Design a protein around this ligand. Structure first.
Ligand SMILES: Nc1ncnc2c1ncn2[C@@H]1O[C@H](COP(=O)(O)O)[C@@H](O)[C@H]1O
Ligand SMILES: Nc1ncnc2c1ncn2[C@@H]1O[C@H](COP(=O)(O)O)[C@@H](O)[C@H]1O
Ligand SMILES: [Mg+2]
Lengths: 464, 460
């Protein structure tokens, strides 16, 4: 990885476009004004992996110089500016980044982090690293979207059961194959794990362990589970044998068995319902059988599966008046699940007097891939410049779109007397009318000055 | 350091225990299940080199995965013995064979694009282990396909409104670096876009192509100097003309793009470009035009209003089709809210107002590289053939409530009839196959260069 090749191409030419004698470029990141509050998570990953330490070398400067020489068909690369950083700071970026603590749940339209150069010669470096810093939109959005789904599950699980036991395992990450890269997989799985503990994207475990860390042995957990290939390999006529072999191999731990390979309704009624009914009613509450449909209308299929199970297994009525499966039998819906359909499924189950205790969800591309930067309007903008000894509050204000107006001047975030958050502009945070700035210095001159445990992030992001 | 033993879906760790007894072979294939009627196959070679080839198993990686999976599952289900066998017998090289259509080939939906099988019976479980890594080829396939479909739309409207295809390969510029989910994705997606175009600002794509594919040209993608809002707004609200004048003077001999909507895009075009700084614009050469960049409001309406204003301040001609053409020193680029849908609406609306497509170029970010899913082309990886207890079985899924989820049966091959249509032969009936062995037992057996891939992915 070469930081001098990790920016938008036109930013190579911007050091020649700022007003002369600009000694400071000061920029900020916000989720511009469902999705009223965002989970701020992912910046520390970028700092540790990409920005800290000696990130400029003679080899990297040469690589970038030759690349841009042919890319622009011209010499525009700021070779002397990058050489200065290598010579004066031993390849350490003279940058200061102040950010809200990761895991903080902040309403839209607030400053989340600020970036400024610490050396007047490096005024151009602030927005050079905009591109790599803006990519924090993705873990912010995954964590925010995951948390909004936790709100949905928490609300309906309480109304149908009276407690939240197992809430952290109600939404399981199945997104490894559906994202665009290995790195994206690890980032997005880790953002999901801010709110839940169930994941099949192993890349998230390794990313957390390396760039955040946890006191717990692992940040995510999973259970043995079948896919279609391991069932259909027994032959169409031996689906019963595949089910029996797998539940036997995993009788001391929860196991999930996909049941829609040929006929999902025949699987729940005949195979699980009668042929292999004895091995279902015999496993522990801690190691139940989990039935997984993977086709048809998500809400219609789970309701039709639950009702078939209600005819072959003892279903009771809990304290809230909702039907509850036996403790040795669960259902996971892991197909076509996003924030929209999840709401539809649990609301439909409640209308059918089915308790949310019976159901868990898996989400793949809907959790980690079908998300964009314009969902929360994640944006990075310059709000303050110092040119020839004068600090100037700068901003954009497009006439055809007042929603894209950006903030002015030096920014700070404050806890209000009512317990909420407000962003002050034009340096008014210096007066500390609402107490101290909440932005902490997390990166300064190539060092990560403030870091957070994943345990601290999970605590900051909890519900209620 | 990357550890392929930690690069799979968690439940696949426990699958070696779920197969029928005496299973010796698992054979799987990738397809874009059955408007994107044809797909560009691209990106597998990157995956092969970066993650699958060479010594990918070590004693340390086995121990790391063992420790992780013990806590992850709260149980010992990691196939440490199977992975040790790979380390000892093949020096940590994967005993798998991969056959694939050549990269850049344009293949209709519902055909086999590559197949995976184990070459060692002890490693029956390994085929679906690396499914997770191989399935992510959906992304470069989908980017390259969607980018090519936009190139069809651009080529068709450029030919109607101008009679030629000059500059086509620079009409859709990659702006997606900040709008993608990771640095690796930016590299993969930008390289896939460069299969069809040559204009890009996502630099990571250049590095990927030179490392894993290679080109005879000095570089696979090109860009030009351009301003952002911070380089304009830093001059002060009252000094937008000074910012403009400084920037076009610093880049007076190359094309330069100046975003002109910081405060009022229509005032910038009529007053600042069309009057105050007009003398700096009418002097520029054809090879170094000013490119005016709107960035807000409705994409098609803002474009039409900018062209109208510029049409009154600068001499407009009529091309050899009856469509208006700005002077060669002035151009427009729309780089906001552009995807394949809004791109179509913009070129349609410009044709309606008799504006040539020569006047416009497009920049696409999230729309080109992020707003895409595995569902777009229904990219799917399924097991179609197993051998258990010495008996070969053609296997497939067929959910009753979704016939479109049906998969193919048995050993597969991809053939072309003498007429030209493509057919995937199932059940081993292929016994000329277009699938060539590209990976076998840890080595890349066949490679393609980016020039070859671009040649295969050309339009008709
Ligand atoms: N641990 C798992 N258990 C069952 N299915 C899985 C698992 N991991 C991935 N998948 C599959 O991968 C698909 C990805 O979802 P999506 O990205 O929404 O298409 C799911 O719908 C499942 O079929
Ligand atoms: N080379 C570039 N020239 C102009 N704008 C760019 C460039 N690269 C990225 N952008 C920004 O990225 C936006 C498009 O990406 P997106 O918002 O993801 O569609 C543009 O409107 C600009 O704000
Ligand atoms: Mg934009």
């Amino acid at each position: 990885f070469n930081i001098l090749l990790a920016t938008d191409s036109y930013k190579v030419t911007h050091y020649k476009q700022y007003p002369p004698n600009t000694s400071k470029v000061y920029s900020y990141f916000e989720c511009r004004e469902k999705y009223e509050e965002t989970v701020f998570y992912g910046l520390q990953y970028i700092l540790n992996k990409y920005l800290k330490g000696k990130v400029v070398t003679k080899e990297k400067i040469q690589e970038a110089k030759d690349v841009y020489k042919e890319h622009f068909q011209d010499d525009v690369f700021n070779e002397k500016g990058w050489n200065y950083i290598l010579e004066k700071y031993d390849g350490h970026l003279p940058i200061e980044i102040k950010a809200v603590p990761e895991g903080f749940v902040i309403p839209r339209g607030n400053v989340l982090f600020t970036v400024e150069n610490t050396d007047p010669e490096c005024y151009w470096l602030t927005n050079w690293i905009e591109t790599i810093l803006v990519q924090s939109w993705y873990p912010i959005t995954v964590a925010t979207n995951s948390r909004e789904q936790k709100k949905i599950l928490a609300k309906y699980l309480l109304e149908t059961s009276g407690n939240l036991d197992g809430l952290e395992y109600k939404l399981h990450d199945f997104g490894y194959r559906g994202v665009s890269s290995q790195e994206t997989a690890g980032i997005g799985a880790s953002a999901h794990l801010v709110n839940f503990k169930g994941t099949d994207t192993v890349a998230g475990l390794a990313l957390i362990k390396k760039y955040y860390g946890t006191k717990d042995p692992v940040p995510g957990y999973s259970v043995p589970a079948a896919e279609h290939s391991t069932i259909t390999a027994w032959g169409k006529d031996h689906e019963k044998d595949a089910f029996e072999h797998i539940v036997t191999q995993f009788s001391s731990v929860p196991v999930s068995v996909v049941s829609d390979s040929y006929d999902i309704y025949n699987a729940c009624e005949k195979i699980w319902g009668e042929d292999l009914r004895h091995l279902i009613v015999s496993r522990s509450t801690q190691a139940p059988l989990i039935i997984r449909p993977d086709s048809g209308n998500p809400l219609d299929t789970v309701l039709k599966v639950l009702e078939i199970l209600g005819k072959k297994f003892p279903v009771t009525e809990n304290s809230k008046g909702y039907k509850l499966l036996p403790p040795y039998l669960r259902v996971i819906q892991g197909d076509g699940v996003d924030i929209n359909t999840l709401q539809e499924i649990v609301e439909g189950m409640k209308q059918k007097m089915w308790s949310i205790e019976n159901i868990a969800f898996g989400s793949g591309g809907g959790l980690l891939q079908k998300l964009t930067r314009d969902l929360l309007n994640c944006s990075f903008k310059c709000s303050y410049v110092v040119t020839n000894g004068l600090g100037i509050n700068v901003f954009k204000d497009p006439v055809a779109d007042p929603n894209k107006r950006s903030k002015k001047g030096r920014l700070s975030l404050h806890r209000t007397p009512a317990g909420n958050f407000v962003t002050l502009e034009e340096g008014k945070g210096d007066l500390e009318e609402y107490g101290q700035d909440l932005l902490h210095t997390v990166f300064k001159n190539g060092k990560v000055t403030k870091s957070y445990s994943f345990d601290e992030i999970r605590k900051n992001a909890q519900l209620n």
